[PDB]
Amino acid sequence: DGMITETKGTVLIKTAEELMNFSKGEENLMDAQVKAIADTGANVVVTGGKVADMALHYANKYNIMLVRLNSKWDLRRLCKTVGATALPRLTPPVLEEM
Amino acid sequence: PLSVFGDRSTGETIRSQNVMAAASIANIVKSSLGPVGLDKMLVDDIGDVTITNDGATILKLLEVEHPAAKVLCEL
Amino acid sequence: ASLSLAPVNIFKAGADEERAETARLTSFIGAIAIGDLVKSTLGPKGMDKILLSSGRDASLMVTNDGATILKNIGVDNPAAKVLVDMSRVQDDEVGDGTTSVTVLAAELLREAESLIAKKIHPQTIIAGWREATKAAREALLSSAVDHGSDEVKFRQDLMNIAGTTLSSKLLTHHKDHFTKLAVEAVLRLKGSGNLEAIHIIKKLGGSLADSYLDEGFLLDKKIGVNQPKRIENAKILIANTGMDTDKIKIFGSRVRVDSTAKVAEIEHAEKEKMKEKVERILKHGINCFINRQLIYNYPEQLFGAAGVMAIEHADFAGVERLALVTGGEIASTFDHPELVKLGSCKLIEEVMIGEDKLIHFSGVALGEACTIVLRGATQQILDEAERSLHDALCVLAQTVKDSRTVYGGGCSEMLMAHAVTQLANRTPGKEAVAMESYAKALRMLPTIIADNAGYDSADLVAQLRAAHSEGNTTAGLDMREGTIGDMAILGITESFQVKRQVLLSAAEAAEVILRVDNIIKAAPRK
Amino acid sequence: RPVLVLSQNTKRESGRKVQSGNINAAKTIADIIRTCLGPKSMMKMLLDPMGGIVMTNDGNAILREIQVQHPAAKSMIEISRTQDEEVGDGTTSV
């Protein structure tokens, strides 16, 4: 899902243009992030947290298999089994981490 | 519909119950048969003690409720 | 095999059912008990009842109205509930007849019980009763007389109808005065059916004869502090505005400044806005101002400095009545003074009624709204007088709506019974017996009327039946001494609508209850 | 509806547990008076239920003054009584 501030999130809207553009820009950012992840050839994505609806939709658009693991022990074991690295952010994985 | 003041058991239930009672009575004394059999030591809940191997004595001393088992005791 | 009388148990704990004979027994017992309870309060010589509430309030209320008696009683018999709802609906539809319909239904169900005991199928009884009801309704319609053309005859009919309605109530002591009172109050409505335009004010103390109808209108609100307490040739402006810390309807709006001077400026701006609102109101050229909502201190002193009365907190009914009586328009915006009509009256002043002060609107312009002041020795007397006056007002309004009238004193009942008997005499089968039972109940109603007076009811009813069979279609009970007389001459008249409703509702509820052959009760929560 | 073969209060025990319990009860009955044998024995004070005091080291008297619930212990008490009645000595030894 899209990253959020750890302190407190508040969308301050002062003009109609911001109100009409905020959701569209957020969706475009989600699409850009998902497509950037997919452009590395990653056809399977495993996450330890929840999956947003927009992120799931864009992953389905780019033919990416989604698996969610609640237990972090299972996540570490999967990383050992496959040879990947648990990324802390949603950045596309480098060649060694995939 | 019968309106009989009591309990009624019919069919396989009562037959199985009678067989259970007879088998329980048999199992009470089945361990005291033959030279390799061993005695039983009965207590009459007032401190009285009776050590015996005879089946008739064991079945007379015990108090039995089921009538099909009373049949075997009096047998 | 019955649902309950079977070895297998088919019910929850507490649920039960009553089969044919048991259900009929319970229904008839409940209906007859309700009828006997509500009766003895019927006719000119009826008596009142005491209703002691068993709750925390322990409210005491003496009354003669059948609907009020049946409302405030703990009823568990389902047929009794049916009859209670019948009486309530009769009260809602028309002001009178609440006791008569219940008594008629109870007598019909008693006759049905007798017929069932005579081994008669209830469907046959229902068919015979339907035919008898049709015949009786046709006869009653044919007997109706209309006087809506002549104004003097219609006024006399209104007098007689109000007197007949008030005859059985506690107001019968001052029947003449109260009849004139009610007729004037109803006629002041100018043909409108709005009974809420007539306000009844109950003030303790004084005699019952001290009750009167104010020639104008009376309000029970207060005037502002510095405003005048008396105005002549008043120009009324009736409003429904805020006029109290009036905040703009924008709701995210707030004051967010960086200094207290700006806060003081905004407060002065709000005060100036209220002053401009008051100036816009005053630009209409008015002497008095009635607002539905509250008026705080700043507009109050503005009106006081303007020399304008500001009556506040006059509720929706209050402003509606003021508009009806003075002709003003209930406004909420004041940007178009020329598009708003102003109420007018000769004088506004304060009066003392007992130990309370009220605002008096004298010399009103329209007057299509009445205030009736009731004075009584006890609170129960005041409540009973209010109920009786409401009955009279409702019946008079119904008569104004539909001017067809029929004669009372049992004349209409005996005429309908005679028509039913004539129909039965030409009908073969047990349907004739059912019709005869129907006519017997119809004759039993004036028999109960005569019983309540301690008269020889049997002889009087026999004389009435003989007179009606002979051809004297206007004969009725003369309760003054205890003979029969001409109802048209003696002036005991009453609304055709009321009697038609009583007959039809009683027959309908009797048919509904008679069709029941099984009562099934779910397990109560208690 | 408590349908039963034997009575409600009837309790049955069998197997190795019965033998172990009988042997342990006899062992503990012996251990009660084990120390009252020989010329260097010690006295024992027995509080009679009727308020009396029995102070002795004779095995039969000590065992007789004791009330027990386990039937094997009752058998041992009867053994002590029989030994006392037959010869009058050797109760603790037996």
Add this chain to the structure above:
Amino acid sequence: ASMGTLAFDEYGRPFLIIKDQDRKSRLMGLEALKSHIMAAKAVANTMRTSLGPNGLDKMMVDKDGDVTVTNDGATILSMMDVDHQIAKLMVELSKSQDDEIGDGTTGVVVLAGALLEEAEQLLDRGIHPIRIADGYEQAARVAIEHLDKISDSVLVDIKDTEPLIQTAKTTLGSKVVNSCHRQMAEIAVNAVLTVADMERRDVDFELIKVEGKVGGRLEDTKLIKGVIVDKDFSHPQMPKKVEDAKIAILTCPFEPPKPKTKHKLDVTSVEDYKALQKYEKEKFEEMIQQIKETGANLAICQWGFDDEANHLLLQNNLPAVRWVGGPEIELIAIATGGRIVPRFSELTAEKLGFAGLVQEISFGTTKDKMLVIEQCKNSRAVTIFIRGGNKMIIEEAKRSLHDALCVIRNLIRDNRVVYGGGAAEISCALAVSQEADKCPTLEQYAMRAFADALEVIPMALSENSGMNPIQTMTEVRARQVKEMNPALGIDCLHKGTNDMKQQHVIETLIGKKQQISLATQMVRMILKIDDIRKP
């Protein structure tokens, strides 16, 4: 036999199998079937007295003391507080018949009870219940085919509603509204025909609003080709009657707009306060002027409005009503031919509805005012307004009118009818008897029992009408056999003839087929149950 098996082992050790087995009960084998048949027989015998024109109502009381007097079998069984599981199955069967058809909810219970009563004496003779169920299914198929054979078609055109009126009258005959029988049938037929997809499609009951008000007379019930509303004009001084009204339907409260998002408007100077005040006043004026621009003579809103809007509406000769519910808003929009406008800026003339008369109705000395919209051009929605002497007959009339509407809907779906009065059941019993003769011996008993159970409806009708059941039913069956006429039934009303064509007693074929099918399936399901494990 009961409570299960209690052994406590043959060694004395505890024998616990099921949790709380000492507190549970169990019925094993044939006695369970006997108990279930007995319960179903009790329910059916209770219901059978409310069958036919001479049937008598049951007077139900709920847990709160509220009293309901009704003849509807589904309603009676729904309000009946039962504990037996088979009784609950019978209630569900009645509710199923009501849902699928809407009529004949009492016949299904009587038929199922008769079927199980015959199955009882069939079981006593040593026949497996599955065999009884199979024979019942075979006989039900035979009866369904016979109904399809002897069915008759009627015209469902709007230019000749006589068969529809007759069918509605037959449906309403058993109810308390038989006093206004023809008027009730007429209004039900007109209500169904007015709102219905003409291509034999569904009839949407959402567009038939049934409202009942106390007072008046039962004959005052009328069909309104519009919408009745339980509201009134907002301002007391607006006119009570509007003719040729141009109607504007709005779902926006006549208040200054506010965003849905959490919003704060900052006032930082006196000029800001003046601007806000002017903006509010101009917003009110603008919304009122926008409403007036379309030429509408009346405005209907859903979310209410405040005093300034009220006075501006009164001042511009714009009668208005507020707080009209969503379903009523939809009904008004459908009937008047107008659209629903979410905000004033989108309100145009072409979205305005039309109504020939909008009026406020008084109801005597009750203070209650109810709005009426009628005289529409081609209104697709209708309203049935019921008056009565008490609430109870009003509810009974409501459910009777619902039965009539459902029957006319069934005619809309399929136009094949079968003459009632027990003629259909007698003919089906005759057909089943004739088919059983050719059948092998073993299923003959089940088929004969099915025929005997089918013949209970004419017997119940004769019993309710006072006639001797067996003699009358035998005579009618003999007449049906002698002369080829499957329309001979029980003369419940003593009209002097047994032919139901002249008496115009007409039942939907779909209703009879559903009755037989549902009764057979429920009887089979009850027959297949052999154990009960209540706690």
Add this chain to the structure above:
Amino acid sequence: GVAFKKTFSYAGFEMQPKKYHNPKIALLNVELELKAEKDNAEIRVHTVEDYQAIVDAEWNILYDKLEKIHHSGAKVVLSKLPIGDVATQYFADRDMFCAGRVPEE
């Protein structure tokens, strides 16, 4: 094919046509209602012009979503999320079918 029970129609639903002969079905997971843009969103304005602009912006957002749905050529609109009365009436005006709160399966 697929068939499911009707799911809590809003006002104005009965005016939508109930039969189509070659419909295109738009499967959406979208809440078509007038609502706050985000849970933590907050609008701060200091002029009535901006107030009206914000209100019209919310309305224009909803109408833009509806117009984007309509211009796709679809005639049947099914959504996993609630569909408001405004959207229902908008689709009814276009002779279109709407059904919100359709279950996942």
Add this chain to the structure above:
Amino acid sequence: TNDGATILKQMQVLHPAARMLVELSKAQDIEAGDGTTSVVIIAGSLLDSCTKLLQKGIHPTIISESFQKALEKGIEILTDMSRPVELSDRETLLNSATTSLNSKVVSQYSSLLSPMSVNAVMKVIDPATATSVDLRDIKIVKKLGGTIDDCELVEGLVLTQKVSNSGITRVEKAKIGLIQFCLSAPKTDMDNQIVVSDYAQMDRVLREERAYILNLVKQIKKTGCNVLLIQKSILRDALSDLALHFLNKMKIMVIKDIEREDIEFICKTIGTKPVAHIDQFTADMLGSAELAEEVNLNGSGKLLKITGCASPGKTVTIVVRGSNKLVIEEAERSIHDALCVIRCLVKKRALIAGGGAPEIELAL
């Protein structure tokens, strides 16, 4: 209590007839104010006679009609045996008040209360024009302590509220001002906050608030006001501590927490027009008075009395004092009875003899 209405109300009677007798007592108190015991006694005797009348075999309706005839005849007789009175005849009024007060606990004090009651009634009405008396114009104040001999008739206004100021308790040639707004920091009806972003804004806000309060107090003082009455305020501090300090520094008595229901009484008494905004606060809208001081009741509380007014408009206050609370309650009830009797004399100018004479004459 000796009052019949009070006796019947206080004890919870349960029988319906007793409840209607209580309502009858209440109605008699409302219409007249005296004879509340006599009416109940009469009703009881009437029903006691009705017992034997019913036992003899007489229908209740006949009894009611005959009782109505007897009531009409008795009203005629009582009207015949009465004599006219004039409100200028003080002796008749004093005798009526004394007769009212004979049966009450305040009988040895009747020589003090009867002239006091007559003066109280006369001072609030116009004898030449008034046809009724509004007893709400006579305020009764009960203060514990002292003896009923210390009861006082105050011509002006008596306030139980204490003076917020300390050191100012007596003002001569006072100019009382009635205030309906709050002397505190500005606070609009709309929700309002002050946003601070710089350190200078802090003391700027403090200084501006001080200046606002000082301007308010200076505007109040410029009119010549020296006694300030502040109406009770909620949701906003009516009187700030800084405002009180400024008012004290300019020698102005301040009395706050004035009840809303007493505004009309105060304005009628001292002739002050209430002020809701500081813009309309002017000298001509104040109410002049001769003296406004706070007195102490010998260590039993403090009372604020404003005696002597330029416009004493139809209003008087009565102070009741006693040893214990029960005797004070009975004394004020008796005073109310005397006022009600004089009110009856005002309404109907007719006098009749007492001591059972009307009842014996009526019976004969």
Add this chain to the structure above:
Amino acid sequence: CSVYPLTFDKNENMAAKKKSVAMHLSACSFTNSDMQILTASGDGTCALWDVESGQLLQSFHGHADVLCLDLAPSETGNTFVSGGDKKAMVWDMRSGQCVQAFETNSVRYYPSGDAFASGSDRLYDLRADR
């Protein structure tokens, strides 16, 4: 149930003024704008009071006894829901009438405003009355 002590035990923090006369109580709840207080009793009547002036603005009686009151914040005059009877009722105080009813103790108004919870001893959409 929650009744704060009498003296307020403070030092004049301009909040000690509380009115709280309690002339009516089972569902006392302060409104959006603090100038009005809404209270209900066991007599089946809902009473609205203005805290500043201190008198009953207008009483609401359309029910048996009423128990739970919840208010939708809009001028405190727009709507308030009562669920005391098994009849959830919504009233508008610009007209003093029950605008809509639902015949079905802890009713809660949803923040959105289109629906409201009706917890007893369901999410009822106001736009569809279902």
